[PDB]
Symmetry: D3
Subunit: 253 residues, 6 copies
């Protein structure tokens, strides 16, 4: 291979300029299976890649693993192989009581509670999504009968203390993160996630285009856990949005 981690060569992508980047290596196949003529490319560490076709054009699906550091490797190495646009698809937990399980969130900007973003730009620089990607995702959702929430996401390097979870080994969060959940709620932050600050900041710095959509499967403020059919239909909703957004971006280019 021509890159350090992914196990890929330029030739293997067959001219792909756009990538869909889920977190879980097992999701790559499922997404590529909504595309035309999909084929396995490689699996190396947490990076499982597939190639598929939308609008008769090649598209990579590559898993990123959890967190900015693995995302930064994935994105950098795909960019070396000619990928210029990156669409993040995920499933998330909301922190606003008006956002329900089954809702779809499109993120315009990220609160940078990560470390990797600071290696591409100083903290004062905005972790903001690409306009054309964000539009394609929003337009894709409304066209498919979904009214997404569009706004800001908190992007944390941790699943536990950074998302102010106390159901843990220590049961503690140190003072800088005590009350942080309420802080973000009061600043109209929709949800937590763990990748978008790195993705958006590095893409803006490198001149690459990024966007993100997620399906809500849990609400931190709400009592009752939903059944794992509404979980799966939520995941489907999100994929339908990202696939259609990818087609719009391709047709537009």
């Amino acid at each position: 291979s021509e890159v350090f981690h992914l196990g890929l060569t330029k030739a293997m992508l067959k001219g792909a300029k756009i990538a869909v980047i889920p977190g879980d290596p097992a999701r790559s196949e499922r997404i590529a299976q909504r595309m035309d003529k999909p084929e396995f490319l490689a699996s190396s560490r947490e990076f499982t890649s597939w190639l598929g076709y939308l609008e008769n054009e090649p598209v990579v699906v590559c898993s990123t693993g959890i967190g900015g550091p693995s995302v930064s490797i994935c994105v950098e190495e795909l960019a070396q192989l000619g990928v210029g646009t990156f669409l993040r698809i995920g499933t998330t937990g909301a922190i606003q009581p008006y956002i329900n399980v089954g809702d779809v969130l499109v993120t315009t900007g990220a609160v940078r509670l990560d470390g990797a973003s600071r290696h591409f730009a100083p903290l004062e620089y905005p972790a903001v999504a690409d306009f054309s990607c964000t539009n394609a995702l929003y337009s894709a959702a409304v066209a498919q009968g979904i009214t997404p929430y569009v706004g800001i996401t908190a992007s944390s390097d941790t699943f536990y203390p950074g998302q102010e979870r106390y159901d843990t080994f220590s049961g503690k969060v140190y003072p800088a993160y005590q009350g942080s959940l309420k802080q973000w709620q009061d600043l109209n932050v929709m949800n937590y996630e763990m990748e978008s600050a790195t993705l958006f900041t590095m893409c803006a710095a490198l001149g690459l285009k990024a966007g993100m959509v997620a399906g809500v499967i849990v609400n931190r403020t709400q009592q009752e856990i939903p059944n794992e059919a509404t979980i799966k239909s939520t995941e489907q909703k999100a994929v339908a949005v990202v696939i259609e957004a990818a087609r719009r971006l391709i047709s537009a280019g």
Copy 2:
């Protein structure tokens, strides 16, 4: 200035004088409020106090405020907060600007999605790590309005500075100096794909996001710091009018979309 004639500390306005306005166009210069209002139906002067000159006018049968902010986040923060107390929910920033990328020309139009926070006021609304990002629908209305008038704007990041001089790494000054933290900073932003400098959007975007208000920004490029040529008054004045026409049409589609 009589506090009895105002429901807010600085603007000299009451809610009723706005006649239900939910949207404001906010230029920097007090002298520009009237001109922008005259693009609307039945324009009327509202008040003038300090750097805050306000007019009302109508678009699509709805009242729209035009209020000047003065230069800088501190004065912008007062203007926005006090209009928000009087029921204004959407703020469209209009201005002219210099660019820092060689491919951006005088006469081009910039729509800003996010701001580098080189200001102070934004930190009074949210911690530094929170993004100074524009409202999606405002940004889309500004872009769409521009395209519908024959203009393809550049869309991207602006550096929002509390100063005109050292914070924009200008050396053509009294001291001729910029201290180390801001030396090389222009090049830094160029290399990070920042389009331009401006002095208000970090505060505007950060505060609106934090308060649940909607903000966007459009600007006409009237100078480029990487370029040698001097631009002429005609193209400059034309660029100002162009950008105003964009902001007005954006307001129109925001109004009709909310109907």
Copy 3:
């Protein structure tokens, strides 16, 4: 000759000192207490008048609200040869012992602004010039006034940075919650919105700055000032700054 102020070196007729209030409406009022007052210019928030004290020309120029517009004013006046800047304002105090009508002379500022950081790193002190501070203090004492002398908190906002809750959101985020009490406990006299930028930039550029303010409101009391109170307090503070300017001119 300068980007914003609409002024030329010639129009200043040799002025080396400026009085810099916030409100453009006050430029003329202050100019009228000097000799041979005349209008110079008005552009955006910057309205400038010229006057004479001890047969020397003195500029009065309004700054607008906040560090950013102050930094433009001071920089551009300095390009035109002004070396000394006297800030006059009205202010709200945060200490109970400070009364409406009192006069404050500020030695240094808490840097809760952005613009100062463009002139020097945060650890550098936003401190007033010795001679300006003394002239302001002396002027006050010579007019029968015992001013408070000390530290001012200089905020880029009027609302959350001064921990106001009487607002559209009614909220202040955690980093500024408890901040007013913090400053009270650190013996800060008052809030204002310009002096951190002024002091820091003047120290950095080798210019001379001082600030005097009249207290029109106390954040620890329930009373709100009427315009007559504002007017008399303003007049009190203007008298101080005019005299301080005479003293600096005479001594120079």
Copy 4:
């Protein structure tokens, strides 16, 4: 059962100690060097095996790349009763005198990651546990190796945070320009991407952590190494980490 790892307390069979490599494919290789190895689970980047040393159960669980995934692994293993964590890896040195084939034991980490700040403020030291560090060192010496002991710079990125210019942009922004030289002049041995998170979280949580690594490349050096010396290096490093687990079990 825990949220990410696909594990229950019962599946660990009382294991109090874990060896934690980064690469999912490496968990089996390492478990093969213990007694009665068995696959446990594979979920996302977390592939876990169980094995026995001095007749005692030991988990081997991959972490993926970076503090974020490490923090999930360690947290969830701690919920299941694991109290000690030994990191094994392969690394690139930044000092001219460190050779390919050398072994590094890390006492402390430069915190160039984000996850560590979710456990403790930046001024708090990312320091290895005293016991673990000694076992790693002793294990190495007993096998004829004098490891370098010292400080590692722990980066959230592979590229700009380690000041690499061989990239898509070819750029590193000013705050990281000259940072490699800065760390060299401060006697930092190497870059790595997980230890700041690991050391800081374990100190905050009351858990025990250590780290050993085999050097397979040197950023300052002309040459390029063959896979012979590389494969023996990582084999050497695994041997040190296994023996260290024994020693800790023994005491």
Copy 5:
């Protein structure tokens, strides 16, 4: 008993002293006290050597601080526990500006906070600024003794070596955050480096105590000329004369 924790002093031992002169070097306490009426040794504990003397019939303490904000912070806090409200710092210093000569006198209005201890009293944005009345007493005293001091900003460093960008050291190195820092301070019109004033000014403002600082310039690292020993002693003696006279003025005024 009634003794403070570090200084070995009780409130009775001060005999009502409200004002202190605070040199850095233990061995200077006696010398400064001998410039006052009826000097007497009080105590010596660690770096803190204290004497009492009288000026204008009022008792005045002289206590050494040791080097750096941490020991200064002990000294000042514990003297305040004993009723001292006013603190006059006296020393000798190098200068970093070419136009400041050996033998000049510096009165410090403000400090660049390159220390740690100041941050334990106030956040970094809070100004390390001297008390108005102390600063005036020092300036007016100097002018009355035919000196015209420079009045300005001093950089207050927690180190003698790297924080003052010194390369003549064991390592020969200064890490990047401090490379170019001397020139940065020169370009921002800073007069000199010293190691205590940020802590002193910040803590005194925070606690409501009054502080001022005067120093005599005995070296200038930007100049080639080397001063002779007479000029140095004359400068030391001059700085001491100013601080004593300033204390007299403050005592008389109150």
Copy 6:
């Protein structure tokens, strides 16, 4: 004298490569008198130095004064004179309830609540002790039948507010330090101290070796005042550990 502050020359050290560094100038002599052929070297400001012999090798004992700034002078100037190893000895208070008066603490790392450490390395760099020094100190303690606590110390530039003391002139601590004691307790910090952050950071930056041991003479969390005999015996206990530690380091050379 060929150093600026200590009043020392390389010849006066007679080849010493190692130093014991207490804080109090009055302690230097009695520590040196546990060694063979003790001799006074110099006294300047807070820096009182003595020389002694352990295992036939010369060892300096030099007092540092209080705080990172004076420590930084002492260590720099001794390094200029050829000293490469620095062992810190003192007595301390503990902030953990289970740490008793009489216990011994060996510090692996320091919380950097000081200023001088930042003049040697940026804040993210760890204030970590030298491995061999720490091992020597641990081993010496065990050999005296002491199980020392081994761990993290908080190193403060102040005695009062930075250790969250309210028994003061003002009786006040500003918000950034309110609740800080509790914060450090919950992060398993053992004790406060005033010099280790500077010492460990500078030594790692300069390539010098440092360690620290201390005897606990007071506990913030405990009710009891301990008697003088318990306190004086704790001092002796800790000094015995540091001397033995130095024997081991010398012997290993």
